[PDB]
Amino acid sequence: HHHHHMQQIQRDIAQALQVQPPFQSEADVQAQIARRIAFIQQCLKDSGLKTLVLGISGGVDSLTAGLLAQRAVEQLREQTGDQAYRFIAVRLPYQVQQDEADAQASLATIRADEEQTVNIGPSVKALAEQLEALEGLEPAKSDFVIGNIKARIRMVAQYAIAGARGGLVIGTDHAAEAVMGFFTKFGDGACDLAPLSGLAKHQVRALARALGAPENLVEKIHGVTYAEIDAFLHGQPLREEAARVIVDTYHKTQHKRELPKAP
Amino acid sequence: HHHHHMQQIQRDIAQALQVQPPFQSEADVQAQIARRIAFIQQCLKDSGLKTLVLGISGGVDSLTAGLLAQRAVEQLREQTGDQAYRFIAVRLPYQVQQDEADAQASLATIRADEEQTVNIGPSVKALAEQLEALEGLEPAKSDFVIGNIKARIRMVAQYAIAGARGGLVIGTDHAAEAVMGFFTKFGDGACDLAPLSGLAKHQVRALARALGAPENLVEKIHGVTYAEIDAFLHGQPLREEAARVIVDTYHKTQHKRELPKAP
Ligand SMILES: NC(=O)c1ccc[n+]([C@@H]2O[C@H](COP(=O)([O-])OP(=O)(O)OC[C@H]3O[C@@H](n4cnc5c(N)ncnc54)[C@H](O)[C@@H]3O)[C@@H](O)[C@H]2O)c1
Numbered sequence: 001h002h003h004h005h006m007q008q009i010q011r012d013i014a015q016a017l018q019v020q021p022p023f024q025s026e027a028d029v030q031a032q033i034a035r036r037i038a039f040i041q042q043c044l045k046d047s048g049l050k051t052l053v054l055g056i057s058g059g060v061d062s063l064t065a066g067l068l069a070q071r072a073v074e075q076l077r078e079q080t081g082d083q084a085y086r087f088i089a090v091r092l093p094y095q096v097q098q099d100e101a102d103a104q105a106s107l108a109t110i111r112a113d114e115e116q117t118v119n120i121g122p123s124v125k126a127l128a129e130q131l132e133a134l135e136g137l138e139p140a141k142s143d144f145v146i147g148n149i150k151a152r153i154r155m156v157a158q159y160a161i162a163g164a165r166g167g168l169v170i171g172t173d174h175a176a177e178a179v180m181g182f183f184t185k186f187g188d189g190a191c192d193l194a195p196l197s198g199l200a201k202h203q204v205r206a207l208a209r210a211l212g213a214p215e216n217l218v219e220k221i222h223g224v225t226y227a228e229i230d231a232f233l234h235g236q237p238l239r240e241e242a243a244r245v246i247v248d249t250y251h252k253t254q255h256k257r258e259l260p261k262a263p
Numbered sequence: 264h265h266h267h268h269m270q271q272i273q274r275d276i277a278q279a280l281q282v283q284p285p286f287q288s289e290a291d292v293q294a295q296i297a298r299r300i301a302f303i304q305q306c307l308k309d310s311g312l313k314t315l316v317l318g319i320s321g322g323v324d325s326l327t328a329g330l331l332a333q334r335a336v337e338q339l340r341e342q343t344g345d346q347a348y349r350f351i352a353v354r355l356p357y358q359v360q361q362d363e364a365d366a367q368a369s370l371a372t373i374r375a376d377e378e379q380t381v382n383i384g385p386s387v388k389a390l391a392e393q394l395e396a397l398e399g400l401e402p403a404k405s406d407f408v409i410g411n412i413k414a415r416i417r418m419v420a421q422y423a424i425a426g427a428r429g430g431l432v433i434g435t436d437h438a439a440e441a442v443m444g445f446f447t448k449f450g451d452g453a454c455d456l457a458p459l460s461g462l463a464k465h466q467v468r469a470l471a472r473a474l475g476a477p478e479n480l481v482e483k484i485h486g487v488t489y490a491e492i493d494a495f496l497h498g499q500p501l502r503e504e505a506a507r508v509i510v511d512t513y514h515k516t517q518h519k520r521e522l523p524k525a526p
């Protein structure tokens with residue numbers, strides 16, 4: 001009884017997240033690259049806009065989305081002759097030295113049409129200084145509040161660039177982050193198009209490799225691992241306790257995967 | 264042929280926005296107040312949280328939502344005995360003197376448990392100064408970009424207070440703003456619960472009056488009026504050209520009323 005119901009829950013979750021079935025062949029990989037580039041281009045055409053905006057963090061998700069975006073606009077310029085199609089990669093410096101070296105390496109991989117650097121530090125500090133609700137907060141809670149402010153102001157910066165340049169904001173959500181709610185609500189969860197949607201983490205990495213990312217970036221690193229999350233998403237064996245945590249986290253974060261609640 | 268299809272489009276739009284039928288009686292008005300208070304309380308209970316956060320602008324929409332929120336938590340404290348239930352009204356000063364007098368009058372009407380003031384000016388300025396994409400922008404476009412930055416940083420501030428205090432962010436969207444996309448995407452459009460959803464503008468005002476708002480605030484003020492928008496939402500007669508603009512604007516803003524696009 002318990003096994004069968006758990007199997008049905010897993011299948012319902014995979015369907016709700018549009019999980020992509022495991023890649024069985026190189027045709028599968030190439031077809032997903034082509035489909036996701038065409039999706040990005042369709043979003044531009046349907047919006048009447050010509051620019052794409054994405055923050056490049058150094059991690060594999062924004063690297064993969066950035067490679068798709070840059071290929072998308074190169075193809076659009078070739079086919080349409082319209083030189084206004086442009087991808088703007090946004091450098092959002094913080095203070096993780098490994099991430100910043102990786103951010104530079106990611107940018108060198110993408111070779112985006114344009115790079116813009118936005119220091120959000122002053123805006124984050126200037127907001128935090130005006131929030132009496134931050135006074136006296138327990139340090140662990142304060143660090144999470146401030147971390148979510150940072151994620152949301154990164155979103156504000158990308159939307160400002162998109163607004164100034166007539167663009168769409170790309171987000172990096174995929175199924176392995178979506179199932180756990182591993183994003184900031186209306187922060188990095190907020191975007192106009194999410195071209196990695198439905199992919200397991202290892203599928204994001206497979207696309208990065210096929211798009212020409214160097215190995216060190218392809219494999220760059222709630223009590224559960226991405227390997228366990230991916231197995232869950234694909235209906236493959238995993239520890240029963242890990243599946244229980246994934247299902248519980250999915251339920252608790254459903255509000256992050258739906259529109260605002262209404263009566 | 265044209266009339267019948269337009270009628271079907273209007274009906275589909277009203278169904279998609281969950282438009283509330285015109286109030287025929289005082290029972291209708293009181294039932295909607297009770298339902299929307301119960302909705303707010305249900306969102307708190309389902310989330311396990313106790314605090315509500317809302318920016319109070321001086322306009323009738325946040326006044327009405329604020330009155331519902333304050334009644335909601337007063338009832339929760341009475342019924343549960345749990346004094347942690349609290350409504351935090353957020354003052355977000357700008358520089359429209361009429362709005363600021365109206366903001367003070369709105370706060371005096373709500374008598375919220377708590378009031379917090381957040382000056383977002385320094386955060387907005389500090390972000391804008393770091394955006395090279397703002398350099399050389401046409402002034403009209405620049406003013407819209409900056410206005411949307413302001414709307415989004417107001418969202419960031421409310422989410423920070425909610426995060427610090429274990430709360431939910433209330434938004435003020437209703438059907439008359441929703442149908443036109445008259446909000447900033449991931450700005451004032453972003454919230455955890457939208458207790459005015461589905462209401463026509465005149466229905467928001469009717470609830471404000473029934474909740475005890477003074478008349479000057481109840482009636483406080485794309486080429487179409489709210490009276491025309493409300494008639495459209497309720498399937499009542501209106502100028503054919505106004506209906507055409509509403510339908511066109513609805514179509515162009517659909518992306519603002521759906522989750523991020525995915526392949
Ligand atoms: N904040 C923490 O204490 C904490 C703990 C562990 C992990 N994280 C990680 O931090 C990142 C951001 O997640 P987060 O939780 O900090 O913030 P978030 O802002 O993404 O989500 C929490 C916010 O959602 C709203 N909310 C919560 N429950 C709701 C419900 N049932 N209905 C409607 N709205 C609801 C509230 O505004 C709440 O502050 C994620 O990667 C998460 O895994 C955070």
Ligand SMILES: NC(=O)c1ccc[n+]([C@@H]2O[C@H](COP(=O)([O-])OP(=O)(O)OC[C@H]3O[C@@H](n4cnc5c(N)ncnc54)[C@H](O)[C@@H]3O)[C@@H](O)[C@H]2O)c1
Nearest residue numbers: 046047162163167168169192407411444445446447448518
């Ligand atoms: N910005 C303007 O030029 C302008 C003109 C008239 C009215 N307004 C008013 O300003 C307020 C905010 O609206 P807004 O338009 O300024 O900004 P917004 O940020 O709310 O919406 C526009 C943003 O949505 C995205 N986008 C646009 N078309 C899309 C599509 N088809 N698919 C996916 N994403 C898409 C882009 O990021 C774009 O910058 C509203 O009240 C509106 O009525 C703005």
